[PDB]
Every structure is written in structure tokens, then in C-alpha cells.
Design a protein around this ligand. Structure first.
Ligand code: COA
Ligand code: COA
Ligand code: NTL
Ligand code: NTL
Lengths: 175, 177
């Protein structure tokens, strides 16, 4: 009974972006910052609607990383949420099926940082990243020690999940 | 008589993808590489059609950069082309006007790397030569992009960006800019 629409950020109205912010604030219970919202904008949104009420969301944003020393185009998953009373009905899974298709069509690798939410991602093919993770700090890479074990990856061309990943720079949490 | 469509890479038919590749090889007279084509995929396409024939294209790719020490979200312009016989009719201008709207709605700053045929057109829709230092990752360490300094141009909707500040781009294959 849910309707799914895939829209680029550039195709959203101000009120649709506001409804997205509202859904994220309510669904994360205070764990979602302004930086997290900036991270949600600029790529593709998969949105779940009950009639006209936005009830679920996930975004896929392009990131430009290194896998060891090789450049890799990444589809990075952000702001995955389903309104509380709509949970445990398969909406999050449909969001991820749609997310996988977008990634397969556009990028060499899907990545995300997971809560927990890890089991849902595993059920649609994602695996824990086994290599070391690095982020830019003051223009120089350092270990993302806190995120290791939490980042998951998905490939439809095969990628070595034991290799090191070097993400690109942003505000807030780099992963 | 030209129709414009804005489509994400994920919304493109396979037909349009192959048409795009041929259009770029034909339009660039030999200096459009496989890495250049990879750089074109993953973001928004603005496509111009004459009836059913694709005649013009520009892509806007999300990039994550540093402006001095500050993280900035970039709409990076790639793979700007109009088929030879359609040029000098304003199609490229319309492509950029559509590009400007996408950038304004999504990113903090527009950036591109221009040519001879490009600069004046981009300037005509508000873009300015980037005056600051440019840097790219080599072996995980930033170095100056001397080659590209003076050729990269930027665009800001509100217009409040220090065009003399340094830019550090994110990593990719082929040309980083
Ligand atoms: C994570 C989240 C998006 C999942 O949304 P969801 O719609 O509940 O996802 P699904 O319903 O597809 O799967 C949820 C669970 O319900 C189960 N489920 C689905 N349909 C079901 C049914 N008909 N009967 C019983 N259980 C069912 C699934 O098997 C899954 O169980 P698992 O998590 O043990 O695999 C949601 O919990 C959420 O918004 N959390 C807060 C935001 C957040 O943490 N986001 C970051 C996640 S990294
Ligand atoms: C750059 C490019 C895309 C421009 O496409 P275009 O459709 O010719 O862009 P426009 O028609 O809007 O403007 C092009 C020129 O025609 C002029 N022009 C605009 N409207 C015109 C009209 N109605 N009648 C005649 N000339 C016109 C513009 O002022 C510009 O002149 P300039 O070169 O002096 O600025 C095209 O040359 C091209 O495909 N080049 C090959 C690939 C390439 O190099 N792309 C640029 C990489 S930066
Ligand atoms: C130090 C923070 N690190 C991780 C950062 C990630 N941006 C975050 O992404 C989710 O949350 C929000 C809001 N904040 C944004 C996007 C969300 N992701 C998706 C797919 O929608 C992770 O959620 C954070 O991980 C923490 O939470 C889980 C955990 C297991 O308890 C810890 N892992 C050691 C903890 O570090
Ligand atoms: C060493 C190459 N450096 C620049 C790299 C840029 N990826 C390139 O972008 C355009 O072309 C192509 C195909 N290759 C891809 C996308 C195009 N851009 C747009 C908006 O569609 C620049 O075109 C290159 O610049 C060269 O050309 C111009 C010049 C002034 O003569 C020289 N000096 C800077 C020369 O370096």
C-alpha cells in the first residue's frame, strides 16, 4: 500500500525538503544534526508515501574515495528512516532494493555507516567492510577508528572488502 | 525547437547512455577519454534534443572539496557538448542556465574546467575564473594543480565566496579537474 518515488534533490520543493527534515528529526529521536541533513542533500532520494504522507526515506549521494590507491566512485547511503509506526513492515527493505538499483546503475561501490540497522542491510546483500578506514583531518588522512566495523559495502565488478578506504572531506561525521 | 530534459544517471535509458557517449566522442574531436566519460556518470544530466535526437548535454556531478580549511559541497560541471552543426544557436547557454539552477538548489558552489570555446560562454552566465590556489591528491597527499590554475571557473548563487581562497578537490582517475 506504499508508493515509492525516486527524486533528485534538485527536483524537490522547499516543503518537500522540509518534510524530509521533519521525518528525519522525528525518526532518529535527536540523533540527527544539521550536518547530517547537509549530507542528505545533493543526490538521489528514494521516498515512501502513504497517500500523500512521506513515511520513509533514503538518500544516495556520490562520493569520490580511494580504495587503497585506486580511485573509486561511491554511492554513499544517507538518512535512512521510516516513521516509527510504519516500521517492521518491509518499507526499509523496499527502500534498500531501490537503493541497490541506483548504485548498480551509477557507481562502483555502495557504502554506508550502520547502527540496529545492520541486519536489514545484510538481508539485501550488504557486508561489513573489513579493511581500514581513513578520513581527512586538516588536509591529512587519519584512521577512522570509531567507524571500523560499522561501515558496510555493496557491489553488484568485484571490490576487495579487505582493502583500505579513504573517504572525501565533509563537515560533521565523515562517515 | 529544442527540448531540454534533466535526468539523473540512474534515470537514463540505456539508449540515452550510448547516444551520450557517441555525442561526446564526436563533439570533442578526440580529447575526451574513458576517464572523462566515467567522470560524467553519477550525477544530473541536462540533455537537449531535436525531436528524438540528442544534440546537447552537460552533467553536474557532486564533489566534496575543501575551501581553505572549510568543507564545501560542489556541483562540478562535466562533459559539456553540443553537436557541431547545432552550435552557436544558444543551446550551450540554455544548458548552463539549467546547470546554474541545479547547482543553486543543491550545492554551495559551482566549479568547472573551461577551454577556449567555453570561457566566454560561462562568463556570460555569471561564472568567474578561480583566482586562488588549486590542489589535488597525489599518493594521498595534496599537491598544487598548476596546470589547471586560470582554467577553473566558479559560480555562486548568492555570490559570497572568496574566489582567492584555496580549493582542494576530491580524488578520481584521469584529470582531477
Ligand atoms: C532502520 C529502519 C529504517 C528500518 O525501517 P523498517 O521499515 O522497519 O525496515 P524493514 O521493516 O524492512 O525491516 C525491519 C524489520 O522488520 C522485519 N519485518 C518486515 N516485514 C515484517 C512483517 N510483515 N512481520 C514481521 N516482521 C517484519 C524485517 O525482517 C526486519 O527485521 P530485522 O531488522 O531483524 O531484519 C528503521 O528502524 C528506522 O527508521 N530507524 C531509525 C532511523 C535509523 O536508525 N536510521 C539509520 C539506520 S542505519
Ligand atoms: C562549448 C560548446 C558546448 C558551446 O555550445 P553552443 O551551443 O555553441 O553554446 P552557445 O551557442 O550558447 O554560445 C556559443 C557561441 O555562440 C554565440 N551565440 C549565442 N547565441 C547566438 C546566436 N543566436 N547566433 C549566433 N551566435 C550565437 C555565443 O555568444 C558564443 O559565442 P562565444 O564563443 O563568442 O561565446 C560547443 O562549442 C562544444 O560542444 N564544444 C565541444 C566540446 C567542448 O569543448 N565543450 C566545452 C568544454 S569547456
Ligand atoms: C561517530 C558517529 N559514527 C557514525 C556516523 C554515521 N553518519 C551515522 O549514520 C547514521 O546516523 C545518522 C545520524 N547521526 C546519520 C546517517 C545514518 N546512517 C544511515 C544509513 O542512515 C552512524 O549511526 C554513526 O554510528 C554510531 O551509531 C551506530 C553505533 C553502532 O552505535 C556506533 N558505531 C561505533 C556509533 O558510532
Ligand atoms: C590536463 C587537462 N586539463 C583540463 C582537464 C579538464 N577535465 C578539461 O575539461 C573539459 O574537457 C574534457 C575532455 N578532456 C572534459 C570535460 C570538459 N569540461 C567541461 C565543462 O565540459 C579541460 O579542457 C582541460 O584543459 C585543457 O584545455 C584547456 C586549456 C586552457 O587549453 C589547457 N590549460 C588548462 C588544457 O589543460
Amino acid at each position: 500500500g506504499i508508493e515509492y518515488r525516486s527524486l533528485h534533490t534538485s527536483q524537490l520543493t522547499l516543503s518537500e525538503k522540509e518534510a524530509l527534515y521533519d521525518l528525519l528529526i522525528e525518526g532518529f529521536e535527536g540523533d540527527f544534526s544539521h550536518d547530517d541533513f547537509a549530507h542528505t542533500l545533493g543526490g538521489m532520494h528514494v521516498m515512501a508515501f502513504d497517500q500523500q504522507k512521506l513515511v520513509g526515506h533514503v538518500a544516495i549521494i556520490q562520493r569520490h574515495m580511494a580504495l587503497d590507491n585506486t580511485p573509486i566512485s561511491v554511492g554513499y547511503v544517507e538518512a535512512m528512516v521510516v516513521e516509527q509506526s510504519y516500521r517492521r513492515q518491509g518499507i526499509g527493505r523496499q527502500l534498500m532494493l531501490q537503493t541497490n538499483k541506483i548504485i548498480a546503475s551509477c557507481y562502483q561501490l555502495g557504502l554506508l555507516s550502520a547502527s540496529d540497522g545492520q541486519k536489514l542491510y545484510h538481508s539485501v546483500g550488504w557486508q561489513i567492510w573489513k579493511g581500514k578506514l581513513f578520513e581527512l583531518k586538516q588536509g591529512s588522512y587519519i584512521r577512522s577508528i570509531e567507524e571500523e566495523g560499522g561501515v558496510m559495502g555493496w557491489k553488484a565488478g568485484e571490490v576487495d572488502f579487505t582493502a583500505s578506504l579513504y573517504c572525501d572531506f565533509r563537515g560533521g561525521d565523515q562517515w
